[PDB]
Every structure is written in C-alpha cells, then in structure tokens.
Amino acid sequence: DDSCQIGTSFTGLDMTKYVGTWYELFRTPNSDEEDFTNCEYDKYTLDENGVIQVTSVAYTNSIRGFITSTGTVPSWTEDTFDIAYSSTYFMVGTDYQTYSIVAGCLDNDYSRHLYWIASHETSFDDATKAKVNEVLAPYNLSLDDMEPVDQSYCVQY
C-alpha cells in the first residue's frame, strides 16, 4: 500500500526487446478504460538518442474518434518499467513476441491491481492462451477471469 506492489517472478526485462506494437487482448475490467473497446494497443519505439518512446492508441466509442497519448519509458528494473509524462508497472511475464502480461495500479488506488494481457497478433492461438494462464495462474487469475478487448477499428486510426 501507499505504493503499487504487484507480485511477479520475471527477470531479465529488456524494454528494448519490448519494442513494437502490442495489442491489448484482455484486461482487468475497470472504470477509466470502460469506453475503449474496438481498438487498444501500445506502440514502443526506440529513438536514436536512446529514448524508448511509447504511444498509447485507443478508439473511444463516445466520440467515435481515437485517444492518442505518448510517453517515454525513462527507466526499468529487472521486472519493472516506468512511464513518463510518473507511473510504475510490473512486467509479470513476456516472451517479447507473442504474449505480454503487464500489471500496475490506477490513480491513487494501490489497493486495486490491474492486469493487461497483450500481443503482437490481434488474438491468441490455443497454444499461447495456455501459457498466459500458466503464468497468470500463481496469482489466481485466468484468461477468462477478465474482459476481452477487440482490435478492429484499429485500421480506422
């Protein structure tokens, strides 16, 4: 409490290998994120001055438009990464190219944890899903314990 702590037994995190476009396929249901439903992905880009840049793109429904936000990831520990212009997120598990389970807290509510399951594809093959639950398991979560998110109005962007 008074800080966002989330279990994770991952290590060797390399935000450089996290570069790319990750589609949010499942997520812990929550208020601020309620609208976004037909397109939600984060894009990681490595600039030449070494900065890792991140752009969040989400298709809101109540505005038939897209919310586009950017930030840089200024640091990152063995299994943790921060986002700037502030917030700290735990890398629960990833293979840098198929699935990616990240997790943090929202606002000042360190009490409520949020899990985000992500991928480079726009959906999981029964193979991956297996693993994602293999990983989510230890915390008592499962892929069907959270809200799926579709990625289609994504090209409309």
Added chain:
Amino acid sequence: DDSCQIGTSFTGLDMTKYVGTWYELFRTPNSDEEDFTNCEYDKYTLDENGVIQVTSVAYTNSIRGFITSTGTVPSWTEDTFDIAYSSTYFMVGTDYQTYSIVAGCLDNDYSRHLYWIASHETSFDDATKAKVNEVLAPYNLSLDDMEPVDQSYCVQY
C-alpha cells in the same frame, strides 16, 4: 551505422584532465547494465609510463558483490576517446570537475545510443543539473528522460 556515430560539439578534450573518479548519476536505461544500481563509477588513473588507466567498478545486486574491470584509454581525438582490453566513445560535454556527459553504443547495436551523465560528487546541485540539460538539450534528452543511479554501497567495495 556499421559504426558508432553520435553528435557532439565538444572539443579540446584532454583525457589527462579527465583523471579521477566519476560517479554515474544518470544513464540511458538498457539491458546489460540493468543490475548495477547501488554503486557505479569509473576511475581514471595516469600511470608513469604515460598510460591512462581506467577501472570500472559496479555493485551487482544478483551476486551481492562488485564487478571490477580495467582498461586503458590508448587514444583520443578532439571529442572522442577509445578504451582498450576496442570501443569508441564520444565526449558530449564536460567541465572535468562537476559533470561529464559521455556517450557510445553497446555491442554491435550502433542503432541504439547510450548516454551516461557523470560526476565527481555523488549528486548534482540544481546548478549543475541546469547545465547538464542545457548540454543534453540539443539532442532532445533531459536529465529526467533517463534512469538515475544511486551511489552508496560504494564504500562497501
């Protein structure tokens, strides 16, 4: 590309005036350098046969020990210096006694640039920080755009 090129508009570099102990206070976040967190400094020593010797000291966490490496700086241009037993680094900006921003590439990845902000002290006074950003600015970097490094387990060495 196919070689490490990094902008810099510094000149009059004199690795002899760079002698001493420089603590790494901020750095571009990156994998190989992930662990080192509670102590990281480079020490430059001028031997009597003219050789400038450099010793890298870093407190790893995953081994509660210290990695100690040495090398000599066999040459150096107007704003460039090399390290031996190979790698070339650009001296982006320094006053030889308060702040020191150096930069290079890592491994064969000339694509990814890395900046290292250094000092003789173990922290910057609001004065210095100002300058360091004044210098970092032209490349679109800022002191809060990169990962801070603490220097304490340093005396444990």
